[PDB]
Design a protein around this ligand. Structure first.
Ligand SMILES: O=S(=O)(c1ccc(-c2csc(-c3ccc(F)cc3)n2)cc1)N1CCOCC1
Length: 278
């Protein structure tokens, strides 16, 4: 449960998530904001098609969602040099996976790709909505306050700490690196064996991941068909994919909350959707 929100920063970007060895083209699953593909382990074991995960390591460029997506496409081509391509993303990862498919569409433009894109409870706008809901709590222009807010939320994912207690400890500090180091020391106190470097990279990258999400708009609409599998403020029906897609937008409501949308009842529906979708 606990170290599943962490990435080995020295780990591989592309990783097998099942033993299925077949001719059928693989499904690539893109990480949530935590960067790890652990959240997909149940799905990947249950799928009859070869499944890989994309995890966000030291190798990943986080200057933009566009750079991240270009890098993930190059990694995919080390096992599947040619399309068509099956891509899914969960939560934050739904934004990224959508960018990857747009780039792939542009690579073959204007010939249509028969690529498959699945979004698990995310979209370019669903992530954007979340970031502002945090900017709402901040003095505009105060970057130190934004850094503090992001890193506080990260520390809260590991500890039972009250919001304002973490806010106090981070707000004074010189810059991001100091805040990152303060956050790692708090988490290390609760879990000493955890790796310094692992946590440092996780805290730092959490801030840059959020920033890239804020700066993202696709260069144009995604022309491919898309499927949204969203959990049981409210953004919209199709998570406003209609504004970023001029292809078929398919919406399915899936049992569970944002976190439990990939387990139990929700997981059964996702597996049946993917298995028929082929
Ligand atoms: O991947 S998510 O889409 C996600 C989006 C935003 C934040 C966040 C926390 S704090 C902050 C911030 C933003 C802008 C600032 F200026 C300062 C802080 N953003 C976390 C997770 N997902 C939402 C659904 O449940 C799981 C997580």
């Amino acid at each position: 449960n606990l170290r599943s929100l962490l990435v080995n920063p020295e780990g591989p970007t592309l990783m097998r998530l099942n033993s299925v060895q077949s001719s059928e083209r693989p499904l690539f699953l893109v990480h949530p904001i935590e960067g790890s593909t652990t959240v997909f382990h149940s799905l990947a074991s249950r799928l009859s098609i070869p499944t890989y995960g994309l995890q966000c390591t030291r190798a990943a460029p986080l200057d933009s969602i566009h750079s991240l997506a270009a890098y993930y496409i190059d990694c995919i081509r080390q096992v599947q040099p040619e399309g068509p391509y099956r891509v899914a993303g969960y939560s934050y990862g739904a934004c990224v996976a959508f960018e990857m498919c747009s780039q792939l569409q542009a690579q073959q433009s204007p010939a249509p790709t028969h690529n498959s894109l699945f979004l698990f409870d995310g979209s370019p706008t669903y992530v954007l909505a979340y970031t502002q809901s945090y900017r709402a709590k901040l003095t505009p222009g105060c970057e130190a306050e934004a850094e503090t807010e992001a890193i506080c939320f990260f520390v809260q994912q590991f500890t039972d700490m009250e919001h304002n207690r973490v806010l106090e400890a981070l707000l004074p500090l010189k810059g991001l690196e100091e805040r990152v180091a303060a956050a790692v020391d708090l988490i290390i106190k609760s879990h000493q064996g955890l790796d310094r470097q692992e946590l440092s990279f996780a805290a730092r990258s959490f801030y840059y991941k959020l920033r890239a999400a804020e700066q993202y708009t696709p260069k144009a609409k995604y022309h491919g068909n898309v499927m949204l599998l969203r959990a049981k403020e409210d953004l919209g029906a199709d998570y406003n994919l209609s504004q970023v897609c001029d292809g078929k937008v398919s919406v399915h409501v899936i049992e569970g909350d944002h976190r439990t949308l990939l387990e139990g009842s929700g997981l059964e529906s996702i597996i049946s959707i993917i298995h028929s979708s082929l």
